[PDB]
Design a protein around this ligand. Structure first.
Ligand SMILES: Nc1nc2c(ncn2[C@@H]2O[C@H](COP(=O)(O)OP(=O)(O)OP(=O)(O)O)[C@@H](O)[C@H]2O)c(=O)[nH]1
Ligand SMILES: Nc1nc2c(ncn2[C@@H]2O[C@H](COP(=O)(O)OP(=O)(O)OP(=O)(O)O)[C@@H](O)[C@H]2O)c(=O)[nH]1
Ligand SMILES: Nc1nc2c(ncn2[C@@H]2O[C@H](COP(=O)(O)OP(=O)(O)OP(=O)(O)O)[C@@H](O)[C@H]2O)c(=O)[nH]1
Ligand SMILES: Nc1nc2c(ncn2[C@@H]2O[C@H](COP(=O)(O)OP(=O)(O)OP(=O)(O)O)[C@@H](O)[C@H]2O)c(=O)[nH]1
Ligand SMILES: [Mg+2]
Ligand SMILES: [Mg+2]
Ligand SMILES: [Mg+2]
Ligand SMILES: [Mg+2]
Lengths: 431, 431, 136, 432, 435
């Protein structure tokens, strides 16, 4: 279980994906040319998880960059770490999906898909022991959403024994005015329920609310929102990226986090919350990290964890701190708040401590929870979808591409069952 | 000539083996290159034409990480490469992967290597199997090996050193599942199993050795010391000896009732110096005190069915019989009525050896007690309860089913545990 | 006052005689098995030898019965170990085959599901063909 | 009736056997190299009973040393008189019995048995007139017990006309070295009832009680218990070892002691009782020596002789004393205590006086009784066996070796019949 | 010439033989090398007991038999090793282990033909063989079992040739086996019809004479045997010197045995005086004769007052005169009953053997000028059979020790047959006494 194959699809997928690659390269001491210039053997011990080693010195991200629109490609190459990527790994169409899931999943996306599988087969076959796949995309657009889910399905067919992991960004009226987003999201969720092993639910509603309420940014940009994503992405992958005991690989993580196959949507949480390239001075204490990381204000999904119950939790502490203090604080949090942890999954909170803090902070905390409160995110998409579907608004955009109303009805039903299943486990008693 | 083959399965099994073999080398004066400037050590070390002493052991893991540390470490020249076996992908904390999916790939190889070690034995006593209950390898691969050893070697003695799971140090939520499945599957194949509760060891390290946050290295050094006491009677010629067969006969009244409680004394920190020298009576008395136990349970609310006392160092039979005479007069130490009381005593000349730079103090005399008490059923009950809590909801079961296991195997395993619990209850009653 | 003395014999280193105090109150002197046979003796000595020998041979007969039972317990222990091996080998193969069957069936069901999606997609694609070009 | 062939099996058998050989060598004036350095022609008159004469001046014990465990064999060689034994006479296996009678009798013991019979045939064929065999073993372990009884049976088959004599040590919870002793003892007793002619019942319960109660040793060791065994063994073998009239050979002893074939279990007694370290002592008169016959406190079997009746008694006095005093004291003891001697066996108490006292004492007395009170020893084993058997505790170790439960039931039944037979003669009246 | 062959069986028989032959040699002036200053110028009666060799050597007309070699090995190494030829000293290797059935049925069978061959060789040197004198114990396996086997065969080989016994009756004081009453009854039954006259020597009677008259605290076999030999010498003196009474063996049966089964005469000897004592006045003929009527001087413990005499013989030795003897017999009849049976005259056959009593130099006995042995067939001797029969009955009722005899090929029926024959013998003594 060494190598992970990373895929970036659409605008959001490529922006969040670029940010991930620049953040982790700095953490592993890799410069934009691909050369290691760090000063810790810990940075290279598990470098093979995300990077290939090529011509001597140099390290190259095992990343595939995809879009139906040529624009984002240029935008990535031009970005800070843009030159680090394999040039042959850039697979771009000419059209763009036009916020239409059907175009991404059945039309233009389907025409570009085999070119993508070409590049992913190449990266996968080079692996000594492939863990699986990590996909970054949005659920509200057409490419990341539709083509993204088509990819998952095609890759799963070829690699059924591997772990399929996603960073799926959920739409919000607060950030995008695209009226069809609930449709694209509902059609995508349906695919994710059936075809992924683990999904990090990154809600633009939560991202916007943090920037506006907490960070006091009147008008937040994608740069502000992406700064929280990159923090989260760095935090959740720390255990895969550095030597440790807990959730060290995608399968072990899935086994600890996923009690029921369909319930694989994680509510990520992070502390401290910061704005872009801003100092600093004063780092959180262990009780502060323990309390802050569990707050509704620190969730990357717009759900209140106190509105549900945790099935399972993975907590990652980064920085130089007392493991004794960490263990004591973590036990206190689950004895004081026992009503938010299901009684029928004993010792369901797992803690890890990484000595290496991320850039900017001396101390940080990442939370990965499988909470029944995530049903709030799905109810919000569902109500928006229904408001539109009830009136058959914009259906011809999708029916024009050969889709039937039945697929809409099916996707909706599947998402309502998922909500209904979370509610079932929220109400389940140990007795 | 009275050989014992040691098998070390998964991370726990391998890391304890490292601690054990390091200690045996110190005890027998064997350098890390296998060179040495009694005779009994030959039951555990074979000799080559070059005068080198090689452990009669096999190290198996489904991932290479842990065993790779052996092949690069201080004792790389101690073992021949062929006796260090590794796969590429671990059993991901899943019993089904260890036993079937992944295990099946390396099983014939492991058996071939054990066959080669058995070929060098003129009078093989049997096997010592070191593993955890919690891991996918420790649970699943061990069950597979055990079953296979019963085919190849029939009734030949098989003894276990099993790591009983503790939440403090636990890495997987599914550890109670893996524990019950392995116990059910191994039950009829094991002659005598010595369980080691990780919470009991953790608390001895904390409370006795003043270690704030004990690590596997700390736990392992202590575990190894108990293992060395159990095996010294086989590796040395002392005042009173006990073989693999003698253990089975004195500790096991019924085939299923094969789980002795281990208690060790004294455990003194490297500091103070005044904290000794403890007498034979003081150390014997310490064996009936719960704080010194290897498994968390209350013997006061249980009955002893067999006792074995393994003394080491400056110890005399008169001092020992005197100490047992007082134990025999204690109303608070209850024995079953169908027992003549039964005390199996072993005495070896060598004082307990400590690893230079370790946490333990050098003692003139020490003792390990192996007692078969009905109180050990409290540990099965604790495991069975955690199993029941998750199983009632079928939580995580899809992971095992996905690997070709059936829900029927879970029910059978639990019913067998229910029977074992009933067996300890029945054995405790008077006729 | 009365005694009858009857001289019997006189010799070089001895003299003998009978002294009679009172004659017998009852007059008329008192008021046998041959031979035996060497053969009769031999018959009886031989009979005793045959008894000693019969019982010695009986004692040996029971010790031989103990010896046969000894080989029988060794054989029972051998037989049980062979059956233990045979049981374990078949229970294990059954278990390895049932799990192979089950694991293959799951992977077949999940590949059929992904291939069904592929069929539905070309069909979706076909419906767009009746919309695109086949209008305006 | 000259030569006796001695066999030592298991740990206990070898420990008690070594002690016997060192004690009698000193009595016959033999140093650890095998050379005679005594100063009495009486020491050599009947040397041929236990020793062979080798090349020149040297004397070698007619002893066979056996174990399934190699350890004890080194322990013997390393012992005081260890170098006196024939090196070829040491027969040891590589894997002990694991305190399992079934392993000693049917498995591991069976594998070593023919190698033992080869050494015993070698010693037996060298004999001018072989009396029989003397075996030292414990009934509580696996080798001495199981293999020991297997040996007796194999010897009984090859030499059916010879006397089979044992020094059989009985287990006790008070000084126990395994939880399964009640099983191993019951299975052994069963074999002894059928296959030996005379057995000295040496009870570890009695030895422990003497050391703790009489010798005031708070924590007795095997060394303390073996000091009483060696005294006893020296005393009971006196008549075989030196010129005399009474029970001078194994068959003559059996004829005087054994009225019914199965009742061949002797309760040995000894006076004065001393501790290893009791290097005092200046005591014991003829009436003092005699009184001890009824003294339960001097019995090497944990039975009260006053709880039963003597069928037959052999009494051996050692030291310089008046035979007149001895005879008078022995008659007084019999007339005063007529209730503990069966009336239907006239003149059932035989007395012998040996001028040579053992080392340490100027005067001593050994008692060999065939008493119905020995049933107490068998009842104690039986009750212990039953407590375990009722629950089938540890039974899988024996059945694992191919044994059936029926053998356990049979051994138990036979021992209960033996008890029942002793009770029958205890109750028998000379109403005739 | 009238030769007697002496046969010594088992330890008791051999050890008594040693004492007897030592005494005979002293009496006839034969040195332990068999040399005798035959430089006489006489009585050649010793020739009935000693043959002569070509070297002028005198060899006892005797055979020593034992199923084990220990006791006879002492004879072949001892003071008298040159007295006996090796061929007349016969031994096996393993004894009859105090078991009649073993000595008769098992071991005996191995050495019987050998013993008879030697007996035949000694008989071949006889011009007028009188018969046999058989010395043995009732108690031991050899003395009991081997003796009865030998007696049966001697009746086959020497039909109607005299056989007399010197049998050691068991005493608990000196007893070595609990089974001695069994062997006693088994041998008595088997030998009964084959013996003409048996002189029983009760070991308790001898033990008590040694203790009382010889002041010996704890008497040994050597003490008992020297005493037994004095009586044996008194019985055999007129066969070995030119005597007048009991001149030939046939005369023992004629003079003392009125019925074939009642052939057990009681012997009484006087005087038995300690050597290590103060110089005393020599006992008269009256004093010694009176002592014949004292139960304390008997060779078997029994009460002649509880019986009747059927025959009496007084055998005097040394300085003795008929006048003193007759006067001694006269004074006794005055003061005592001395009851004879209806059909027998009340009287005595008297013999005077001028050959002085002889003692072993350095022994316990005092040399006396005159001594007497009385041989009387009294019904009181049945008291000794009754004492034996009672001990037999006590053990036999429980079948105690019987397995030892059965194991050797004997049948339980033999024990009953032997006891019934003893019951008949007891009834015979009762019947003979009646009137
Ligand atoms: N957090 C975040 N959300 C983004 C970003 N870019 C776009 N989105 C969101 O994602 C959805 C639009 O997805 P896009 O990536 O632009 O659509 P696409 O996958 O490129 O497919 P098409 O443009 O239809 O070809 C909306 O909900 C936007 O709010 C970004 O960089 N960060
Ligand atoms: N005492 C002790 N316990 C250990 C050690 N390593 C792991 N464990 C315990 O063993 C269990 C985890 O099982 P492991 O042995 O690590 O897993 P594995 O056998 O390698 O199986 P997989 O990794 O799932 O293929 C948990 O209860 C751990 O706390 C160790 O070195 N010492
Ligand atoms: N008196 C005395 N008893 C002993 C001694 N050694 C052992 N015992 C007793 O003998 C029994 C054990 O017999 P062992 O000889 O030790 O067992 P083993 O014959 O060696 O059989 P294995 O060890 O299994 O091969 C127990 O009842 C002990 O009380 C001793 O030295 N003296
Ligand atoms: N007077 C006397 N009695 C003896 C002598 N030796 C043994 N006895 C008695 O004879 C009986 C024992 O029988 P033994 O003659 O010794 O035995 P054995 O004829 O040699 O027969 P076995 O030894 O059994 O083969 C006991 O009553 C002894 O007291 C002896 O020298 N003199
Ligand atoms: Mg786009
Ligand atoms: Mg592992
Ligand atoms: Mg042993
Ligand atoms: Mg004899």
């Amino acid at each position: 279980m060494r190598e992970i194959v990373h895929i970036q699809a659409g605008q959001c997928g490529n922006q969040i994906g670029a940010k991930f690659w620049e953040v982790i390269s700095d953490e592993h001491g890799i410069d934009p040319t691909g050369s290691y210039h760090g000063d810790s053997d810990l940075q290279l011990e598990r470098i093979n998880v995300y990077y290939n080693e090529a011509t001597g010195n140099k390290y190259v991200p095992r990343a595939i960059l995809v879009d139906l629109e040529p624009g984002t490609m240029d935008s990535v190459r031009s970005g800070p770490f843009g030159q680090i990527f394999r040039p042959d790994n850039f697979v771009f169409g000419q059209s763009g999906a036009g916020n239409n899931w059907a175009k991404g999943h059945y039309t233009e996306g389907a025409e570009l898909v085999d070119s993508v599988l070409d590049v992913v087969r190449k990266e996968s076959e080079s692996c000594d022991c492939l863990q699986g796949f990590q996909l970054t995309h949005s659920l509200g657009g057409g490419t990341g959403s539709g083509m993204g889910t088509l990819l998952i399905s095609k890759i799963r067919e070829e690699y059924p024994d591997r772990i399929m992991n996603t960073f799926s960004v959920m739409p919000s009226p607060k950030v995008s005015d695209t009226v069809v987003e609930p449709y694209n999201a509902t059609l995508s969720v349906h695919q994710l329920v059936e075809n992924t092993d683990e999904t990090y639910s990154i809600d633009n509603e939560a991202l916007y609310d943090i920037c506006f309420r907490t960070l006091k940014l009147t008008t937040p940009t994608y740069g502000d929102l992406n700064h929280l994503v990159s923090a989260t992405m760095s935090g959740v992958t720390t255990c895969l990226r550095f030597p440790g005991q807990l959730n060290a690989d995608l399968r072990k993580l899935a086994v600890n986090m996923v009690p029921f196959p369909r319930l694989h949507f994680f509510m990520p949480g992070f502390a401290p919350l910061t704005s872009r390239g801003s100092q600093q001075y004063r780092a959180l204490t262990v009780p502060e990290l323990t309390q802050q990381m569990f707050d509704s204000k620190n969730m990357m999904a717009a759900c209140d964890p106190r509105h549900g119950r945790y099935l399972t939790v993975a907590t990652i502490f980064r920085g130089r701190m007392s493991m004794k203090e960490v263990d004591e604080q973590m036990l206190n949090i689950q004895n004081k708040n026992s009503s938010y942890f299901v009684e029928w999954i004993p010792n369901n909170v797992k803690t890890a401590v990484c000595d290496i803090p991320p850039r900017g902070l001396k101390m940080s905390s990442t939370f990965i929870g499988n909470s029944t409160a995530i049903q709030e995110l799905f109810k919000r998409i569902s109500e928006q979808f229904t408001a539109m579907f009830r009136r058959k608004a914009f259906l011809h955009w999708y029916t024009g591409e050969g889709m039937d109303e039945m697929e809409f009805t099916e996707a909706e039903s599947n998402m309502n069952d998922l909500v209904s299943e979370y509610q079932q486990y929220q109400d389940a008693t140990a007795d | 000539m009275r050989e014992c083959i040691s098998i070390h399965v998964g991370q726990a099994g391998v890391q304890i083996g490292n601690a054990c073999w390091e200690l045996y080398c110190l005890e027998h004066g064997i350098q890390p290159d296998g060179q040495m400037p009694d005779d009994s050590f030959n039951t555990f070390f074979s000799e080559t034409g070059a005068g080198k002493h090689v452990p009669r052991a096999v190290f198996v893991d489904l991932e290479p990480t842990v065993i790779d540390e052996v092949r690069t470490g201080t004792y790389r020249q101690l073992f021949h490469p062929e006796q260090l076996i590794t796969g590429k992908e671990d059993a991901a904390n899943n019993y089904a992967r260890g036993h079937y999916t992944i295990g099946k790939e390396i099983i014939d190889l492991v058996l071939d290597r054990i066959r080669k070690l058995a070929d060098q034995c003129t009078g093989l006593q049997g096997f010592l199997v070191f593993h955890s209950f919690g891991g996918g390898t420790g649970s699943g691969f061990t069950s597979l090996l055990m079953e296979r050893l019963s085919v190849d070697y029939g009734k030949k003695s098989k003894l276990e050193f099993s790591i009983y799971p503790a939440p403090q140090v636990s890495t997987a939520v599914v550890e109670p599942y893996n524990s019950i499945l392995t116990t059910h599957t191994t039950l009829e194949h094991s002659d005598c199993a010595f369980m080691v509760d990780n919470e009991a060891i953790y608390d001895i390290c904390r409370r006795n050795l003043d270690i704030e946050r004990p690590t596997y290295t700390n736990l392992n050094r202590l575990i190894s010391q108990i293992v060395s006491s159990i095996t010294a009677s086989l590796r040395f010629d002392g005042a009173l000896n006990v073989d693999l067969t003698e253990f089975q006969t004195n500790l096991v009244p019924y085939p299923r009732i094969h789980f002795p409680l281990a208690t060790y004394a004294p455990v003194i920190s490297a500091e103070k110096a005044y904290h000794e020298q403890l007498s034979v009576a003081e150390i014997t008395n310490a064996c009936f005190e719960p704080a010194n136990q290897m498994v968390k349970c209350d013997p006061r609310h249980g009955k002893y069915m067999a006792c074995c006392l393994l003394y080491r160092g400056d110890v005399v039979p008169k001092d020992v019989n005197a100490a047992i005479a007082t134990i025999k007069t204690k109303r608070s130490i209850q024995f079953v009525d169908w027992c003549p009381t039964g005390f199996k005593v072993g005495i070896n000349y060598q004082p307990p050896t400590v690893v230079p730079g370790g946490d333990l103090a050098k003692v003139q005399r020490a003792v390990c007690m192996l007692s078969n008490t009905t109180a050990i059923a409290e540990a099965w009950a604790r495991l069975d309860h955690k199993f029941d809590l998750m199983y009632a909801k079928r939580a995580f079961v899809h992971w095992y089913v996905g690997e070709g296991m059936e829900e029927g195997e879970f029910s059978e395993a639990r019913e067998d545990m229910a029977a074992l619990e009933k067996d300890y209850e029945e054995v405790g009653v008077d006729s | 006052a009365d005694m009858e003395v009857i001289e019997l014999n006189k010799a070089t280193s001895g003299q003998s005689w009978e002294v009679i105090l009172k004659p017998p109150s009852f007059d008329g002197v008192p008021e046998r098995r041959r031979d035996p046979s060497l053969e009769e003796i031999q018959k009886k000595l031989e009979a005793a030898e045959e008894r000693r020998k019969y019982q010695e041979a009986e004692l040996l007969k029971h010790l031989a019965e103990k010896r046969e039972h000894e080989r029988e317990v060794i054989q029972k222990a051998i037989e049980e170990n062979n059956n233990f091996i045979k049981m374990a080998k078949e229970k294990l193969a059954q278990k390895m085959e049932s799990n192979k069957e089950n694991r293959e069936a799951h992977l077949a069901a999940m590949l059929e599901r992904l291939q069904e999606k592929d069929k539905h997609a070309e069909e979706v694609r076909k419906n767009k063909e009746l919309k695109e070009e086949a209008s305006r």
